DNA sequence: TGGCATAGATATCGCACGTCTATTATCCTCAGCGCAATCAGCTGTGACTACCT
């Protein structure tokens, strides 16, 4: 199932990028939580918005 | 015949409009101290009586 669901639908809408940890969305965060661009430049965008790890 | 503008049809993301339980230091109460005019006992003074001369 992990092999199978590894970013298989690849999605690019803004909403879905929304509370889902396998995209983290830099600005669908929360106030407490934040990136670490050390570990995470780019993997992915979305309507000019990018994705971290 | 064929290139593609121009608007019909449709969602789509952003800005704005509702709730919700807590990223961290209160409000009264009783016991313990204090302050100011009586009242009573320690100590001083006079009245009464013992003893050395």
Redesign the pocket.
Known sequence: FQAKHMDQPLPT???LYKNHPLYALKRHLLK?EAIYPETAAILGYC?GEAVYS
Do not use: L, M, P, Q
């Open positions: 809408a803004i909403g407490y309507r």
